[PDB]
Design a protein around this nucleic acid. Structure first.
Lengths: 61, 124, 246, 49, 147, 403
DNA sequence: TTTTTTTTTTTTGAGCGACTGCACTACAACGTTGTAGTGCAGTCGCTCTTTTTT
């Protein structure tokens, strides 16, 4: 549960940044699809990143 | 209050994968997949207006200008070129701050780019 | 050069006019204009304003000065107000008058306020700001916020349990506790359990009755995010964002 | 008798701060401007102070 | 609604979740206790810092009184042993540096058990306390109606 | 250099390469499309930075650049710096054609040495290659440039029997040779009409009505727009200036007033989109398929007033008049803007005011613009002064190539 | 005096202060060895209120 909470914290930190760093969610291409980040689309993005971005960190050294 | 709501933008479109798909298309796809779905499939590119002219001279370096200066300084220091000539070139265009502050900025950027080049050209 | 003026520039010009020698006679013209002054909200008084009002209405006969204010509400020190000007005014004047009766809240909340702020002497840590026990109204002595179980008390200090906690975790836990209390008051309020009772009259608690008092924008956004997760819509009254930034 | 009230005063304040930084921080030598840069990056930090 | 925007308004039920959060003033800009004039100390003298922190604490107490005196029927407070210091477990908490803990702990530094005993000391029919429970069962019911 | 010349090159090489017998691997190596020089090098609207400026050259084996007469010196220098050390470049264009747009004359200063001839070894090499008798050039100044050049003199679409080629040969000679060429028997190809006063202007408008007679006959009969465009593409006026009594907008407004006078074209004063107006585009538009210098005819097919354009593929496209980015009346085109196009019956109109635009190359491009029939409306002194005054451009290529 | 054309983004927090681990000497117990206090270095949280006057 601790890693499942820290991954949600990292996802909310990287999607919407602080008041000094522009986050990834502040973009004209993501606001057209959805206005508010629903947890269903969040889990869909998580599943797609687990399907595709896994060899990025698997072969990283 | 008798109207239909906004349906979802996501719809299953017919698409046939061609024979010859170049590497540049895959790079533009995997740089941003939603942008490549927008500006290439439906050809919708949201063209934002250009930034206005600032009212004063640049006292600091931040954003795209600092990144371009760091890129040119790293491309100059990777060949062990004269950093002072590029300093005079950037000072002749007015992109650097006036007087000593531009020299301090160029000195700290040259220190950072030399620290990066000592790792870059170590295995080149 | 441009000939423009500002809000504080009027005060500075009037203070420089009364600072001169002939302008004192101009103050007599003000004593010819209005031989009285009733100044409301004297806690939000700049020192230039009090210097002007002392230049005009210090000790002249037939002219009256009535400074109606409250030192316990001077919260605009960021804007330019200052409580030391009010303390100088209290040291300068001789008579003091106070309002005993309170007509807004229930007597339970009044007794809670008079109990919390009268624990020690000089709770506002200044000698010239004394606290007095106010009295509740006779017409509002039957106000009761009743729950499903019994009569809920006035002040409920939700003590978060633990030895030491951070800032973000404490804010998140208290926002979740506040959202749980809001959804418990709204879920039981739509069934006729949680009520506001004036004597025998009853009223169900809607979503507009409960209000969260915050101090900053980050904790307000934290409260709004913790409340919109439980399917509870909330408005931000202090939202000063421009419509052109959407 | 007639004057024009302005709502925002931050623009003229920033202009006067930029004029002060021009007439004070430009002719300094390197050994003083190093300390001035260590205190504030520009006139914006001085105005914020 | 913020505390400054709630001056003079009226609300039935008021919740104050972050009334214990405080911020320490760093700059030395105070007022003299005799001349009542604004004194700006450019040097880092400890007396000017203490005289500015006293005015900051008085402003926080006035904000606490403003936020407390806006409830009509019920007000709820969020109390916690908040520590502004970077040490996690140092044996003492910074609630005495806030506005609420100056009235709860009577202006004295204590611990979490001391804060709990100071909370439980002033227990009346109007003032009660309860622990913070983390839990959610269901969001809400819409109960919409036709037009 | 231009998109319209690129479209003409694509359609010409498409209709030319399918005639010759090829193989299955040879049809795979057919050139796909012709690109603009600003599109091949990757020019941006904001910045002048190219994609293949100095670092990465274009990955090409052979590069055929058509119409090098419209290539200025900076575009030539930007094309040179983009080429690798193994690509072979073939330049196309005419030597006596009109000069470049900006400052510079690359193709003329290159082909000025084509009149000297080849080398003594290169003549024997070409005789061994072609198997015929190739003449040799006297002297040797720059053997590489004189060997790389070639001169085409035998024209196939017109011979010595047609007066167009004889007039083009007499343009480069003295003006009295052109007067003699127009004078004796006119070769049944070139007519000369004197334009001095208002009655000559009315006669010129009457001869333009006689030239646009088949176009108006197909317009009034409510026929298909393809034959209307094909009849409009046979007669064309060529003017020098833009405004005034002698120019584009002057001749256009006078022709519109003459169509308002005589019962040839019905025009509403507030509609601005009457049936039968010729328009031309000023900016390129690859999305609509129309380029700069393309003609369109606005008419009513039955669904409303739409502008029909003749595509080089052989079809016709009906576009809404609101979909046109630019539109200017093209009853008379300028000689600079009519390059690349071809017209069957051309009529040159020169202004009476002395201007440096009317020179030898302008009259040469007005002569070569006509396929079969050419008319002239100018004074004798202006035609005598335009031939002698050649648009010379002083450049250092005459001294740099000589050493 | 005339005329040519072009569609690709990129970047962005750093000083303050703690947590943890390794190394080095001081000092006492058993010349040598184990425990404690302090210094240096890599890593990570965190954090930057409130508003209205003609």
């Amino acid at each position: 549960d601790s890693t499942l909470q820290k991954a949600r914290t990292k996802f909310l930190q990287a999607y919407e940044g602080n008041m000094m760093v522009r986050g990834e969610g502040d973009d004209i291409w993501y606001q057209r699809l959805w206005r508010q980040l629903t947890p269903e689309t969040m889990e869909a993005i998580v599943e797609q990143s687990q399907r595709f971005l896994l060899p990025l960190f698997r072969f990283n050294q | 209050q008798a109207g239909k709501a906004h349906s979802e933008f996501v719809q299953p479109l017919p698409f046939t994968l061609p024979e010859t798909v170049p590497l540049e298309t895959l790079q533009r796809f995997w740089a941003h997949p939603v942008r490549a779905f927008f500006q290439m499939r439906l050809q919708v590119n949201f063209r934002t207006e250009d930034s206005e002219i600032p009212d004063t001279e640049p006292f600091i370096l931040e954003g795209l200008s600092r990144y371009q200066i760091n890129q040119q300084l790293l491309n100059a220091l990777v060949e062990q070129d004269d950093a002072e000539r590029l300093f005079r070139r950037f000072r002749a265009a007015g992109d650097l701050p006036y007087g000593a502050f531009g020299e301090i900025f160029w000195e700290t950027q040259c220190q950072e780019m030399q620290q990066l080049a000592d790792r870059v050209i170590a295995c080149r | 050069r441009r000939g423009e003026l500002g809000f504080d520039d009027m005060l500075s010009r009037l203070d420089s006019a009364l600072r001169s020698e002939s302008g004192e006679v101009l103050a007599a013209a003000i004593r010819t204009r209005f031989p009285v002054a009733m100044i409301d909200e004297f806690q939000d008084t700049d020192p230039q304003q009090y210097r002007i009002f002392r230049r005009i209405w210090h000790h002249q006969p037939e002219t009256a000065l009535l400074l109606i204010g409250d030192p316990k509400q001077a919260i605009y020190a960021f804007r330019g107000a200052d409580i030391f000007t009010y303390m100088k005014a209290r040291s300068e004047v001789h008579a003091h008058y106070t309002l005993d009766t309170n007509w807004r809240s229930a007597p339970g909340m009044v007794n809670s306020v008079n109990k919390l702020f009268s624990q020690t002497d000089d709770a506002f840590m200044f000698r010239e700001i004394p606290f007095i026990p106010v009295k509740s109204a006779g017409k509002n002595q039957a106000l009761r916020f009743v729950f499903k179980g019994e009569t809920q008390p006035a002040m409920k200090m939700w003590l978060m349990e633990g030895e030491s906690c951070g800032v973000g975790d404490y804010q998140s836990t208290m926002a979740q506790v506040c959202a749980a209390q809001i959804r418990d008051w709204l879920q039981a309020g739509q069934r006729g359990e949680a009520l506001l009772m004036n004597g025998d009259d009853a009223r169900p608690v809607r979503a507009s009755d409960i209000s969260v008092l915050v101090r900053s924008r980050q904790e307000a956004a934290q409260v709004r995010d913790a409340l919109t997760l439980l399917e509870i819509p909330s408005v931000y009254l202090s939202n000063r964002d421009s419509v052109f930034e959407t | 008798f007639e004057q024009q009230l302005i709502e925002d005063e931050s623009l003229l304040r920033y202009q006067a701060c930029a004029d002060f930084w021009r007439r004070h921080c430009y002719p300094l030598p390197r050994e003083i401007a190093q300390v001035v840069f260590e205190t504030w990056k520009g006139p914006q930090a001085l105005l914020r102070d | 609604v913020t505390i400054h925007k709630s001056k003079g308004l009226e609300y039935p039920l008021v919740w104050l979740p972050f009334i214990t959060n405080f911020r320490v003033q760093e700059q030395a800009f105070y007022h003299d206790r005799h001349s009542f004039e604004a004194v700006l100390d450019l040097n880092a003298a400890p007396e000017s810092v203490d005289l500015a922190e006293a005015e900051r604490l008085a402003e926080d107490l006035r904000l606490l009184y403003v936020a407390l005196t806006r409830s009509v029927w019920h007000c709820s407070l969020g109390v916690a042993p908040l520590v502004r210091r970077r040490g996690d477990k140092k044996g003492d908490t910074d609630v005495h540096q806030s506005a609420l803990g100056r009235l709860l702990q009577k202006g004295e530094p204590q611990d979490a058990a001391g804060l709990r005993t100071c909370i439980e000391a002033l227990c009346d029919d109007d003032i009660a306390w309860q622990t913070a429970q983390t839990g959610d069962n269901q969001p809400w019911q819409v109960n919409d109606v036709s037009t | 250099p231009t998109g319209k010349a690129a479209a003409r090159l694509t359609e010409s090489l498409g209709k030319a390469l399918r005639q010759l017998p090829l193989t299955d691997e040879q049809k795979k190596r057919i050139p796909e499309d012709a690109s603009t020089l600003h599109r091949l090098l990757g020019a941006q609207p904001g910045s002048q930075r190219l994609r293949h400026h100095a670092g990465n050259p274009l990955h090409l084996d052979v590069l055929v650049v058509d119409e090098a007469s419209m290539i200025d010196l900076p575009m030539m220098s930007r094309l040179i710096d983009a080429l690798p050390d193994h690509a072979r470049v073939i330049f196309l264009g005419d030597r006596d054609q009109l000069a470049s747009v900006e400052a510079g004359a690359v193709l003329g200063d290159i082909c000025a040495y084509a009149n000297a001839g080849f080398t003594a070894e290169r003549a024997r090499q070409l005789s061994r290659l072609t198997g015929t008798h190739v003449p040799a050039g006297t002297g040797t100044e720059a053997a590489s440039l004189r060997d790389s050049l070639c001169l085409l003199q035998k024209s196939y679409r017109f011979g010595s029997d047609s007066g167009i080629g004889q007039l083009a040969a007499a343009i480069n000679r003295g003006d009295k040779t052109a007067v003699k060429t127009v004078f004796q028997q006119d070769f049944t190809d070139i007519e000369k009409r004197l334009l001095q006063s208002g009655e000559d202007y009315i006669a010129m408008l009457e001869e333009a009505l006689a030239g646009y007679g088949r176009y108006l006959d197909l317009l009034q009969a409510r026929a298909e727009p393809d034959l209307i465009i094909q009849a409009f593409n046979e007669y064309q006026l060529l003017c020098a200036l833009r405004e005034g009594p002698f120019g584009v907008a002057g001749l256009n407004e006078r022709i519109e007033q003459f169509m308002q006078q005589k019962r040839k074209i019905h025009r509403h004063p507030h509609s601005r989109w009457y049936e039968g107006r010729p328009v031309m585009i000023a900016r390129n538009d690859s999305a609509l398929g129309l380029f700069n210098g393309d003609i369109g005819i606005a008419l009513d097919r039955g669904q409303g007033t739409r502008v029909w354009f003749a595509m080089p593929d052989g079809n016709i496209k009906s576009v809404q008049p609101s979909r046109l980015p630019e539109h200017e009346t093209t009853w008379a085109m300028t000689v600079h803007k009519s390059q690349g196009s071809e017209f069957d019956h051309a009529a040159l109109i020169l202004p009476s005011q002395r201007t440096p635009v009317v020179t030898r190359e302008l009259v040469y491009t007005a002569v070569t613009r006509a396929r079969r029939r050419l008319s002239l409306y100018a004074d004798e002194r202006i035609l005598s002064a335009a031939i002698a005054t050649r648009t010379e451009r002083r450049s250092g290529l005459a001294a740099l190539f000589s050493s």
